[PDB]
Amino acid sequence: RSLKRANLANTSITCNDGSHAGFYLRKHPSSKKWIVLLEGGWHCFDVRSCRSRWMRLRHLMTSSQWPETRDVGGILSPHPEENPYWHNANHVLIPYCSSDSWSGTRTEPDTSDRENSWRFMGALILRQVIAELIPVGLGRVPGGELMLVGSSAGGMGVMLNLDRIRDFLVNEKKLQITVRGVSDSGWFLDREPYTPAAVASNEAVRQGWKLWQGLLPEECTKSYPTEPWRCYYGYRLYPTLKTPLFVFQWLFDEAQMRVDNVGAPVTPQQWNYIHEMGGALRSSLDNVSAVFAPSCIGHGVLFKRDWVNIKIDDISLPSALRCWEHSTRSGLRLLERCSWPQCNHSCPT
């Protein structure tokens, strides 16, 4: 049966347009394990991008179109064939309606522009959802677990908020619970674009950070006192992250191709750029302890039925995630050993 819509008790926590935020829940009768998944879908960082987003992707800026139930595959599927190790866990979906990579703390619209009217509350939404799971069972029985997982902007969202959420549950609330995070397709790089963009990658990030009042991890901003927004990049944040984080990243990630302004690749120049992009991604993952990085073009995987089919060295993604789970109960570096696009026989399409 489906994930059912739920409300937040604090009605001041809202989506971009002021509609109330919320989540979807499928409670399991006896599990003490919880999978909380953050949806993604880019972001907006100024008046023009946010107007375009409202016109083209309205459902990401409001809860007014949310249905009463949702069905999500992959790691939130209740079917053992599709979700071999977490089918019988408590499942939570948090829709993305804040356009701020789950970092925003801006309760009222920016004073700078009285014409920029959007609320950016992503960080406060996540914190409120985790708070509302507690009276519904999260951490109630000692020995329980929380895996906080996210795709795309949700993957960033996990990285940004993981240590805070862990500290809230374990230190503030005194729960006897193991917390871990998974970032799927949220590991982005700032690098020279294929051709010059309308605005520098880093310039959009800085503007967003200001507009959203982005809440960034304290340990990471200490390393970047003059440019704290560098902490939106996973490879910059990772060295000071204390809580276990599994990283899934397609080596030829389609969102990174859009960031790098490659275009739909139809020339050898574009393809060579993509080949090199893959190598840069691979290098950027050098210090990650638990990584699953196939040589395929894609974006997102954790909500997809075919997540069970992607394999590296004949090890499936759910199998790798399960082995990471075992090893962090108090990891595997699976990066493709061939370097070129679609050299993995199990690539989806």
Add this chain to the structure above:
Amino acid sequence: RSLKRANLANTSITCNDGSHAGFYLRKHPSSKKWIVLLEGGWHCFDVRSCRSRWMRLRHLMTSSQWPETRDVGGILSPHPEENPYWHNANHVLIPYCSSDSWSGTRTEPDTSDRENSWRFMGALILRQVIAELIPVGLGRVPGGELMLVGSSAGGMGVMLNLDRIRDFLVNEKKLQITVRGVSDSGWFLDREPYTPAAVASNEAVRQGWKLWQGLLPEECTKSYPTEPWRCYYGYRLYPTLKTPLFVFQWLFDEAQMRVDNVGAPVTPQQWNYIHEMGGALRSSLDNVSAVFAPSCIGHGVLFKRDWVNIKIDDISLPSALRCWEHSTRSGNGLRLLERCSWPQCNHSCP
């Protein structure tokens, strides 16, 4: 379909009585992975014990009672529910008919006594089976794998022979194959018994070594040149073992209780001895990289249907073995020892 009996091409490789050795096979049409399971069943170490074994356990000294097929559960089951990760591998069973912990090389009876007719060829049987799997497909396609696994005396057999077999396949034959070992209930301790035994452990061990002409790994025997038979103990051999080895051991192992001469426990004194034996086993596993050691009374696990049900920290044995397999895929770990210390404190004990 069952595991089907196969013969060896070399007819000098025999069971204790001189009957021909062999193995059972279930070839999978596609897989490049092989599970090779060594059966156990104690050993005999002198004339008297071998005579008793012939009379009480004859099937362990001969192939004359072997059936044409065998069905073995656990890691050799072809059913996914029973064997979630290896149901679709090639499977091989090597029956135990040499009574020498898979270590013997005595090809000809000790001529000094004509009523001692026994051949002890366990190390030679294993080597030959492996050699004979090559034309059948072992390591034929690059990228394949061998998991050499063993219970009881077979667990010891794996530990004794693993580096040799890996060297044979990878170096001698140049196969592009990843080799790993598993010892189930093969990790024994020489400790003071609950009450003194008629024969003392290290005495039996030394006698068996001589009688079997036991073949021991060189890197271990260097450390014990005066007493190479010390290398029959897992904790002594482990430090110099190069190949990945997963150790399953029940912390209240029944064979250890038999060697320690506790008797069927019906008194607090016996139970307190058993409790401390578990503590000693636990402690002997201190340096082992990949271990699954539940607080349960038992002996053997890999051939059992219920192997899927034993859990430590909610991690099943097959799931731990699979994670070790992933983590050792380059030929280089989860230490799951029970967190409570007392007999049957695990809710999943069989």
